[PDB]
């Protein structure tokens, strides 16, 4: 009887707005920007289905040194995007790092510099994996 959840990041086409990339905040490797919040919604399902699910992300790392920093799509460089949990903790992009208002999954996103960031726009893609119990 129980159906899976209608998943929605943002409001349309799974699109999340990021902040602007200020190079003066990202001048060096290890430098981070301020983090913008976003939510992923698990709609139209039993609240015990949604909560008891295991979620993970999957994307191309910026370099081998930074496997939890998501690369960009060229056009700012020396910088990628990082996704954080509810309290500000980075998450992996290998797609094997689980586990578990109503049915909201709160996230944050921020820029991680891998060096002196050059100006330009930052557009990044990834995949969000929902695996049901």
């Amino acid at each position: 009887m129980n159906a899976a959840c209608a998943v929605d990041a943002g409001s349309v086409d799974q699109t999340v707005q990021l902040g602007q990339v200020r190079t003066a905040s990202l001048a060096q490797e290890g430098a981070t920007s301020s983090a913008v919040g976003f939510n992923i919604q698990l709609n139209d399902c039993d609240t015990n289905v949604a909560s008891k699910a295991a979620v993970a992300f999957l994307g191309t790392a910026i370099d081998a040194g930074h496997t939890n920093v998501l690369a960009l799509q060229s056009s700012a460089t020396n910088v990628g995007v990082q996704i954080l949990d509810r309290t500000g903790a980075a998450l992996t992009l290998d797609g094997a790092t689980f586990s578990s208002g109503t049915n909201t999954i709160p996230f944050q996103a921020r820029y991680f510099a891998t060096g002196a960031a050059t100006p330009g726009a930052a557009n990044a893609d990834a995949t969000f994996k929902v695996q049901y119990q």
Partner: protein, 197 residues
Amino acid sequence: GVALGATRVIYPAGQKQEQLAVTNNDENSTYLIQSWVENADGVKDGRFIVTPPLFAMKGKKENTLRILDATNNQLPQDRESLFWMNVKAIPSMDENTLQLAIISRIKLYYRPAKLALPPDQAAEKLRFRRSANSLTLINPTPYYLTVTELNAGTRVLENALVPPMGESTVKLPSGSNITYRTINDYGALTPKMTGVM
């Protein structure tokens, strides 16, 4: 907002096909839908065919996926085999943005036709052995048991997927009274069952 019509699929040996509904609840969003079946190793298995493997949903839609047994009767016939049904929703495009595809993963149990034990009796056969710093769940039945709300006395343990005639092993915080629920074929929580470690 792409969703599935179930949280697991039971595929009974002998059926030419199995059906799974996929929906989108959002009139504003447009999705490309890519679907495939993986084994227990997460490797794309040609043993189950999904049609359409690729199609588009422009707005609020419902499409039925057809799951086809292509196993050539080579899977075990005394136990369930675990597979993973994968359905990926790829959104149409758009200023500094993060965009996400969504992969819904659900269990696909190939279930042979002549198992002795009725599926409804499976959960009550689960046994628990205590080790040094861990608890081992022992499954003597031919069915995959999704064990949830596992409690040892007062402490709440991790959720386990105990394979047929096999075992799984969670950690113990270090009670003897065990309670647990499982999820049935309809994706529903069973009542609370008691165990003894």
